Write a protein that binds this ligand. Structure first.
Ligand SMILES: *[C@@H]1O[C@H](CO)[C@@H](O[C@@H]2O[C@H](CO)[C@@H](O[C@@H]3O[C@H](CO)[C@@H](O[C@H]4O[C@H](CO)[C@@H](O)[C@H](O)[C@@H]4O)[C@H](O[C@H]4O[C@H](CO)[C@@H](O)[C@H](O)[C@@H]4O)[C@@H]3O)[C@H](O)[C@H]2NC(C)=O)[C@H](O)[C@H]1NC(C)=O
Ligand SMILES: *[C@@H]1O[C@H](CO)[C@@H](O[C@@H]2O[C@H](CO)[C@@H](O[C@@H]3O[C@H](CO)[C@@H](O)[C@H](O[C@H]4O[C@H](CO)[C@@H](O)[C@H](O)[C@@H]4O)[C@@H]3O)[C@H](O)[C@H]2NC(C)=O)[C@H](O)[C@H]1NC(C)=O
Ligand SMILES: CC(C)[C@H](C)[C@@H](O)[C@H](O)[C@@H](C)[C@H]1CC[C@H]2[C@@H]3COC(=O)[C@H]4C[C@H](O)[C@H](O)C[C@]4(C)[C@H]3CC[C@]12C
Ligand SMILES: *[C@@H]1O[C@H](CO)[C@@H](O[C@@H]2O[C@H](CO)[C@@H](O)[C@H](O)[C@H]2NC(C)=O)[C@H](O)[C@H]1NC(C)=O
Ligand SMILES: *[C@@H]1O[C@H](CO)[C@@H](O)[C@H](O)[C@H]1NC(C)=O
Ligand SMILES: *[C@@H]1O[C@H](CO)[C@@H](O)[C@H](O)[C@H]1NC(C)=O
Ligand SMILES: *[C@@H]1O[C@H](CO)[C@@H](O)[C@H](O)[C@H]1NC(C)=O
Ligand SMILES: *[C@@H]1O[C@H](CO)[C@@H](O)[C@H](O)[C@H]1NC(C)=O
Lengths: 740, 185
């Protein structure tokens, strides 16, 4: 045994493209002393190669390792193994096999050949490239599996489950098929022992799975499908049931009867369900842990009988029509409540004082997007050891000041006060929050200067001050925050030059200064920021010239930490001259689009077009370039250096309405990603470089009001653009303009 | 979102390595918020510019269901397949540029049903067959480049075609008429 053991191990070691792979593996050594190898009584019962980039084929594995007598388990997870399953010799001693997160390819039918392992119970093939070409006939012919995970594969077909269970589900305790495309009907009724089912993220347009008696089933996930029909009567046969995720489906009607005895997790979320929360649900109060009804037509108020449930950890009412006052009496009857999301409802009224208690309990309080009115509670966080993490109040009718009692919440990682009528100044005491990550105050009546003490927050990531009345210049202390990936200050009265210390931030993705009084020269130190893909400078007093070294960081840019945040891009149409710049990028998390009319007073933009929404998604993980540049409407002067063309990922460039004088560089032709370009109203002269005909991405351009002369390039997209954009260029000729 | 469904079918049939069609969501109220797609004040699509997106595959007939569609620029791609015979269902299309592609098949007859057509540039393609005489009934024709193609037959000197010069019809397989420099038998 041991001789052929080590010899098989080494014979496998010989097939690895990386000669140094297994450090402790060699002849003349006890195999049981090897890394990732667990040996019992000088007989090998285990091998763990997981998370080791072997870069080898499966064929090499089946012959050498799987032929080991007495080997119970082999974990190949994330080992970079390619190829397909073939007929081989397998010991009956084998128990568990993990092939997950690998490159295995070909038809799923090959798995039928795993029957060579007589004692095989546990099999994880999840996250492979395996598929199922064409028809499904015969069966998997493995009935011995207590656990089967097919998740995250390329399989596309119908009733594949029947092909899996063809040999019977009798011994199967676990099934996960998820992350695939599968349709048809699901019959588990022959499997009485199945405790776990994940079919989620699939193609089923048909009825719900047939559960039969559903005696032993503790887990049902049908989510991520087109499913419709009656699931109540189907699961009515299930006495013991814990987790049910039906979310993201076509289910309709009122909430039907359910097996609430053993129920722990329940999600009806993201469906067409109507009506309000039923009474009988209280029957689950001895059990239920957390609940998600989000994304439905539900309205009304929360049943107070839920006070019988002390075990509710999380309550999500979000994205519904709900209104009314706050059942603080019922909510205080829930001891285990942590995250409360009321967001996107019609709830109204002022804030009950008793709320001051919840600061010592709730992890997350989201009241955002409601009809709420009244002041912010100054008595908040009076209780010792405040446990609050995330507070989202945005989009309400809240009035009054911002009490600096909020510093008494020391666990707060997120504060969103935005989209409100709040008055007063910004308390320097907020600097006393070391754990705060996202601070978004934008769209308020806030006045007064910016606290220097904010320098005391090193963990600051996102700061949204946009659309306020704030005055004064920028505190140098902000430089001490190295973790800021987002800086947006817009439509404010802030003045003064632009800090030169911005280069100190390697983590900063986005800088928006738009609509302000800032002056001075654009710092070349911007070229030291490697995270920065977005800059909107448009309406300001900046004088001076434009440095060419600002683009030196392009090509090394890493936007990784920037992703995952909700955004809105409001495109400026050139119809109204009072709305300036290419567009406005603002942080939209927890806010309704329908309330954007609150900007009517703060901005001159309507006629019903046009809004862009989404989540932050840079076009590159690393080594990219600046995606957005708007300097339009400024005093900037001089000539543009050749470096302007070093950013191939740049989508939009607006230098418009400036004093810029010189010749358009041929390097402009090097931008393949530029959709919209406004150079309008400048002193730029010379000929349009023929190289600009290399730009195929432009859907919009404005060259008007320049000193440019010569023929318009005929090729490229220039022919698509209207002469309206080419006006006030005396020496300029050629189509679309008149022929020379 | 009929327009959105149609354009989505187009996306499905298309091959998109750079994922420029990734922004297109069928669940959306309309296509108007998609990249490279432009809609009017009536919230109907007047424009689609996919030009030089490095795309493969072939097109879909559902394009013909866009009534207010104006500009279509598909140019500079590997795209293959025939030009849809029902494209004549587009009344308002003022510009069609398919040039620099693998496009095949005869020039569709129903194109004669485009009254407002201004730009048609097919140059550097694989198209064959005769040049439809119904195109002469299009009086709005301004710029046309058929050069470097496989097109064959006689070239009409009447209608709007009188506006054009041999360089547009140049480098073809066999073309005859007063318009070409090669005579008809
Ligand atoms: C940079 O930001 C600044 C500030 O954010 C911004 O300046 C503001 O621009 C907005 C939009 O043009 C101005 O909004 C206007 O405000 C007027 C009052 O000054 C108001 O007129 C009447 O409204 C009030 C309140 O209703 C009323 O009591 C008074 O009798 C005023 O006469 C305007 O109302 C107009 O618009 C509304 C709806 O939009 C419409 O119902 C009305 O009939 C009327 O047409 C309008 O709301 C705001 O005053 C400006 N503030 C300052 C300090 O200048 C810049 O425009 C931004 N710059 C750029 C380039 O973006
Ligand atoms: C079949 O194989 C797949 C692929 O591995 C497997 O899916 C993965 O399961 C693991 C659990 O083993 C998941 O890892 C967890 O992810 C959560 C995030 O949701 C983490 O919070 C977890 O961290 C805890 O556990 C760590 C140790 O594992 C601790 O170090 C840590 O402090 C936490 O206590 C945990 O890492 C993983 O998310 C999935 N999905 C993948 C990898 O895509 C699947 O479970 C296997 N099937 C069966 C039946 O086991
Ligand atoms: C990476 C993030 C920082 C950024 C917000 C990103 O997620 C965002 O989606 C960017 C890539 C989008 C937001 C607005 C988009 C632009 C929206 O506005 C423009 O009018 C449209 C017009 C037309 O649709 C063009 O095809 C693209 C074009 C010009 C879009 C180009 C790409 C965007 C600039
Ligand atoms: C309930 O089912 C949904 C449907 O897939 C699961 O998906 C989560 O929520 C959204 C769906 O809109 C996904 O984009 C997220 O990736 C999922 N969240 C997480 C934390 O993974 C959801 O996970 C299911 N709920 C539970 C408790 O498993
Ligand atoms: C397996 O990896 C080797 C390594 O080069 C490669 O030659 C072979 O094509 C791979 N097999 C599959 C199916 O990708
Ligand atoms: C910007 O303008 C002011 C005068 O308005 C001047 O003093 C300053 O030096 C200028 N900056 C540069 C770089 O010329
Ligand atoms: C299509 O053209 C591109 C460049 O324009 C070229 O790289 C590509 O290989 C061509 N397609 C095929 C199938 O060869
Ligand atoms: C058009 O085709 C001709 C030959 O058919 C070729 O010489 C020419 O380069 C092509 N045009 C372009 C822009 O590639």
């Amino acid at each position: 045994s041991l001789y052929r053991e080590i010899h098989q191990l080494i014979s496998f070691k010989d097939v690895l493209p990386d000669k140094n792979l297994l450090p402790d593996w060699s002849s003349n050594k006890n195999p049981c002393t090897f890394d990732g190898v667990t040996c019992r009584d000088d007989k090998v019962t285990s091998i763990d190669l997981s998370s080791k980039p072997l870069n080898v084929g499966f064929s090499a594995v089946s012959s050498s390792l799987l032929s080991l007598t007495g080997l119970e388990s082999l974990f190949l997870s994330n080992s970079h193994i390619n190829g397909s399953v073939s007929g081989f010799k397998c010991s009956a001693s084998l128990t568990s096999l993990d092939l997950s997160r690998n490159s295995l390819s070909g038809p799923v039918t090959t798995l039928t050949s795993l029957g060579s392992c007589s004692g095989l119970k546990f099999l994880n093939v999840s996250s492979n490239t395996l598929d199922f070409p064409g028809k499904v006939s015969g069966g998997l012919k493995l009935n011995s599996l207590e656990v089967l995970d097919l998740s995250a594969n390329s399989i596309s077909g119908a009733n594949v489950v029947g092909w899996v269970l063809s040999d019977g589900c009798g011994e199967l305790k676990h099934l996960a098929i998820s992350g695939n495309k599968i349709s048809g009907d699901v019959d588990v009724s022959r499997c009485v022992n199945l405790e776990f089912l994940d079919v989620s993220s699939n193609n089923f347009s048909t009825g719900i799975p047939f559960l039969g008696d559903c005696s032993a089933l503790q887990h049902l996930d049908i989510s991520g499908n087109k499913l419709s029909g009656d699931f109540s009567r189907a699961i009515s046969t299930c006495t013991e049931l814990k987790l049910l995720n039906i979310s993201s489906n076509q289910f309709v009607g009122p909430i039907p009867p359910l097996p609430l005895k053993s129920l722990q997790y329940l999600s009806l979320a993201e469906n067409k369900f109507t009506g309000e929360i039923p009474d009988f649900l209280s029957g689950a109060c001895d059990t239920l842990t957390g609940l998600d009804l989000s994304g439905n037509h539900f309205y009304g108020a929360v049943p107070p009988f839920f006070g019988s449930c002390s075990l509710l950890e999380s309550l999500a009412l979000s994205s519904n029509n709900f209104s009314g006052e706050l059942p603080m009496d019922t909510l205080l009857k829930m001891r285990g409540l942590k995250v409360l999301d009321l967001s996107f409802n019609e709830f109204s009224g002022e804030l009950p004082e008793s709320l001051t208690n919840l600061s010592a309990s709730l992890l997350t309080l989201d009241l955002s997007s409601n009809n709420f009115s009244g002041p912010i509670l100054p008595n908040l966080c009076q209780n010792p050891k405040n446990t609050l993490q995330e507070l989202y109040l945005q989009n309400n009718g809240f009035t009054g000041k911002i009490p600096p009692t909020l510093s008494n919440c020391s666990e707060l990682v997120s504060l969103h006060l935005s989209f409100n009528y709040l008055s007063g100044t910004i308390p320097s005491s907020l600097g006393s929050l070391s754990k705060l990550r996202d601070l978004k105050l934008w769209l308020n009546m806030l006045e007064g200067e910016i606290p220097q003490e904010l320098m005391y927050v090193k963990t600051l990531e996102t700061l949204i001050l946009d659309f306020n009345d704030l005055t004064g210049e920028i505190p140098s202390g902000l430089s001490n925050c190295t973790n800021l990936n987002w800086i947006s200050l817009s439509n404010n009265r802030l003045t003064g030059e632009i800090p030169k210390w911005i280069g100190r931030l390697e983590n900063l993705a986005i800088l928006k200064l738009s609509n302000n009084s800032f002056s001075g020269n654009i710092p070349a130190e911007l070229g030291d920021c490697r995270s920065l893909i977005w800059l909107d400078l448009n309406t300001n007093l900046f004088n001076g010239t434009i440095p060419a070294a600002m683009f030196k960081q392009s090509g090394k840019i890493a936007a990784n930490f920037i992703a995952g945040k909700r955004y809105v891009y409001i495109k400026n149409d050139g119809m109204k001259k009072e709305c300036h710049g290419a567009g406005n990028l603002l942080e939209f998390q927890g806010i309704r689009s329908e309330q954007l009319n609150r900007l009517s007073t703060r901005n001159p933009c309507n006629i019903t077009s046009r809004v862009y929404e989404g989540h932050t998604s840079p076009t590159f993980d690393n080594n990219g370039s600046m995606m957005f540049l708007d300097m339009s409407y400024n005093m900037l002067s001089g000539y543009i250096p050749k470096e302007i063309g070093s950013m191939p990922y740049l989508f939009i460039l607006n230098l418009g309405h400036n004093d810029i004088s010189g010749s358009i560089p041929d390097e402009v032709g090097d931008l393949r990603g530029l959709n919209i370009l406004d150079l309008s109203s400048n002193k730029l002269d010379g000929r349009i470089p023929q190289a600009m005909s290399a730009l195929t991405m432009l859907t919009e351009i404005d060259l008007s009001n320049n000193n440019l002369s010569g023929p318009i390039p005929e090729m490229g997209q220039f022919e698509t653009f209207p002469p309206a954009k080419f006006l006030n260029n005396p020496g300029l000729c050629g189509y679309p303009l008149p022929r020379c | 979102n009929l327009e959105g469904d149609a354009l989505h079918t187009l996306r499905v049939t298309l091959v998109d390595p750079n994922n420029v069609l990734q922004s297109w969501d069928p669940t959306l109220v309309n296509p108007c918020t998609w990249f490279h797609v432009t809609c009017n004040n009536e919230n109907s699509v007047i424009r689609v510019d996919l030009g030089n997106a490095e795309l493969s595959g072939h097109l879909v007939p559902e394009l013909g269901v866009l009534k207010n569609l104006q500009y279509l620029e598909l140019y500079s791609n590997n795209i293959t397949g025939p030009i849809p015979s029902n494209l004549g269902n587009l009344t308002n299309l003022v510009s069609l540029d398919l040039y620099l592609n693998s496009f095949s098949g005869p020039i569709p007859e129903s194109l004669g049903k485009l009254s407002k057509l201004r730009f048609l540039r097919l140059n550097n393609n694989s198209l064959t067959g005769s040049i439809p005489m119904s195109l002469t009934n299009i009086t709005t024709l301004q710029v046309l480049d058929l050069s470097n193609n496989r097109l064959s037959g006689s070239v009409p000197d009447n209608g709007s075609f009188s506006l054009f010069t041999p360089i547009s019809f140049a480098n073809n397989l066999d073309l005859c008429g007063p318009v070409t420099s090669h005579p008809c038998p």
